């Protein structure tokens, strides 16, 4: 007794368990014999609608269904475990998000697509904002004045506690509208975005950051090359 | 709900008369004790099955008392027109009162009163919830009819809501016979 009382809210969904991993484990091995070229992606940050657009942009190319550490075991971390020759060296070169592309498209097609592809994204933590913005020194609005304040809508009172406490800014409620006494500088160029700084920009919807999937290593089922035309 | 409460009280009185007469002629502790539980047993059963009406009464009680103290007898100024076309802010201008100014269609769901004095005589302005039927709108219909007042109709021509006056004029004729 005297233990944390576990809490859970009843929902239709349920945990997948290890059986899901087993299907994941075999999926990578099957792809090595089906597709021609193998690529590993390092998209440390993702957006699901953007991922679907990348996934749906083509049919032959397939993003492997699996988990990073499971991918390593599926690919084989040793010469005695590799499903194909020279694959074990390739597996140990990727870490983090489960980025990996299996496709039959030519290498020139792969590099051209990723190099040209680019999309906007929110200022994620650990990054530096490419711009600076100061909140108006009076009543604040939904967009913070980035768009004309006349067109902007006043911030809803319900979000005041988040700004006052979570973001730590000295906000207060005045007749249902949040007000500040000074033009608080949310962030500036060169500063590494803390979670609070990123959240403030995220709350305002300022997608002042670019996003593109970075790929490092390339592999083939017969050439077995470990060339890495890394693009950042 | 009120009828059920009276019925429950009558049954409680029947409970006392029945068991008290039986209890006063008892001859053993268990008989009196067991019969005592029987007497109070029905009271619990009667009240226990009365849970549904009781909940409704409490909700009405916590809301009926909060209703504005509008006086049909004294002089009042009814406000009517297209939903929250400038009318809602008008009440606050006349006297010390607060009404939501955010201009969405039905900015007010219930009545408001604002007291002001003219010629050393008390007056109270009344704001309608809104008229397009809807049960909420039904509150205004009876307020217009059964309140001694000269109602003011609100419309816009150049600045607020840009709505067509044709609809307002046509809607006005619908209420014309009543008020």
């Amino acid at each position: 007794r005297s233990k944390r009382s576990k809490l859970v809210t009843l929902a239709q969904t349920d945990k997948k368990g290890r059986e899901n991993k087993e299907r994941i484990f075999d999926e990578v091995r099957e792809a090595l014999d089906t597709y021609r070229y193998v690529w590993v992606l390092h998209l440390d940050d993702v957006r699901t609608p953007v991922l679907q657009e990348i996934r749906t942009s083509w049919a032959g190319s397939k993003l492997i269904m699996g988990k990073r550490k499971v991918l390593q075991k599926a690919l084989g971390e040793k010469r005695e475990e590799e499903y194909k020759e020279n694959l074990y060296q390739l597996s140990k070169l990727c870490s983090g998000v489960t980025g990996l592309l299996f496709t039959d498209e030519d290498v020139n097609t792969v590099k051209e697509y990723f190099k040209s592809y680019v999309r906007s994204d929110y200022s994620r933590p650990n990054t530096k904002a490419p711009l600076t913005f100061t909140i108006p020194e009076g009543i604040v609005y939904s967009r913070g004045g980035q768009i004309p304040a006349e067109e902007d809508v006043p911030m809803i009172h319900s979000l005041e506690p988040t700004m006052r406490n979570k973001f730590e800014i000295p906000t207060k409620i005045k007749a249902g509208k949040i007000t500040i006494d000074s033009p608080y500088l949310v962030c500036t160029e060169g500063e590494k975005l803390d979670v609070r700084q990123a959240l403030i920009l995220k709350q305002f919807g300022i997608a002042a950051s670019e996003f593109k999937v970075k790929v490092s290593a390339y592999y083939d089922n017969d050439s077995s090359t470990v060339e890495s035309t890394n693009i950042n | 709900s009120l009828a059920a409460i009276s019925r429950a009280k009558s049954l409680v009185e029947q409970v006392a008369r029945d068991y008290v007469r039986l209890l006063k002629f008892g001859q053993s502790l268990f008989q009196c004790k067991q019969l005592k539980r029987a007497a109070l047993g029905r009271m619990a059963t009667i009240v226990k099955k009365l849970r549904d009406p009781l909940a409704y009464l409490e909700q009405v009680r916590q809301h009926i008392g909060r209703l504005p103290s509008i006086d049909p007898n004294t002089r009042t100024l009814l406000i009517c027109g297209y939903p929250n076309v400038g009318k809602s802010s008008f009440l606050r201008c006349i006297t010390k009162s607060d009404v939501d100014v955010q201009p969405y269609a039905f900015t007010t769901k219930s009545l408001y009163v604002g007291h002001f004095d003219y010629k050393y005589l008390r007056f109270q302005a009344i704001d309608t919830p809104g008229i397009l039927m809807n049960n909420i709108e039904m509150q205004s219909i009876y307020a217009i009819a059964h309140l001694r007042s000269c109602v003011l109709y609100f419309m816009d021509l150049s600045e607020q809501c840009g709505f067509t006056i044709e609809a307002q004029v046509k809607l006005f004729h619908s209420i014309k016979p009543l008020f």
Binding site: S5, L10, Q12, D14, H157, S158, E160, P161, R164, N165, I173, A175, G176 | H63, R66, L67, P68, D98, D100, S110, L111, Y112, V113
Partner: protein, 73 residues
């Protein structure tokens, strides 16, 4: 006090400066005070608490059981 004299004060004023902190702290403390209440509250207080507490757990368990059938089906 027209009708909405306090619900218009939840907004346009906020409940307090730090209101959720008091409520959040109290909710966590309820788990600890429940144990204290069970051991304390002698007499009729304990009997009522024990009977009421047992019903709450029994009712809670029934809700979980009903959901399982709905979730699976």
């Amino acid at each position: 006090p027209q009708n909405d004299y306090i619900e218009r004060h939840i907004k346009q004023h906020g409940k307090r400066l730090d209101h959720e902190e008091r409520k959040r702290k109290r909710e966590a403390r309820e788990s600890h005070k429940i144990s204290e209440r069970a051991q304390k509250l002698t007499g009729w207080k304990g009997k009522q608490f024990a009977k009421k507490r047992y019903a709450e757990k029994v009712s809670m368990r029934k809700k979980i059981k009903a959901h399982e059938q709905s979730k699976v089906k």
